[PDB]
Amino acid sequence: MTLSDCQQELSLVQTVTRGSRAFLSREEAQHFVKECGLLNCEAVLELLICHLGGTSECVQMRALGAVASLGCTDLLPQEHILLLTRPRLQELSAGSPGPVTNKATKILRHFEASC
């Protein structure tokens, strides 16, 4: 589909979202951010959003961590990151109380504050 030519971006998102810890390490975040600078960041973000849906709680937490890390760079305007992520972040922030709901809320509030 429209992401089929984004195999490098897909491999990056699969790497960053696998792991048993819910928080990216400093080294994992910096690597993710460096690779984002070389790939299509918007395609990366859309693949992260895909991983916010069906997966496990840990994958969701790591995907949200990667969204937060990308939002704290200048790779995309922060208003553009908000445009792309607001619908899913709003849906998660409306969920049952818990770690994913809490983290999605903080990310959404931060992106809204910046704009």
From TrEMBL:
Query: Can you state the subunit structure given in the record?
Result: Interacts with AP4B1 and AP4E1; the interaction is direct and mediates the association of TEPSIN with the adapter-like complex 4 (AP-4), a heterotetramer composed of AP4B1, AP4E1, AP4M1 and AP4S1.
This chain is encoded by the gene named TEPSIN
Q: What is this protein called?
A: AP-4 complex accessory subunit Tepsin
Its annotated function is as follows: Associates with the adapter-like complex 4 (AP-4) and may therefore play a role in vesicular trafficking of proteins at the trans-Golgi network.
Q: Which residues of the full protein are shown?
A: 307 to 421 of 587
Annotated compartments: Cytoplasm, Cytosol; Cytoplasmic vesicle; Golgi apparatus, trans-Golgi network membrane
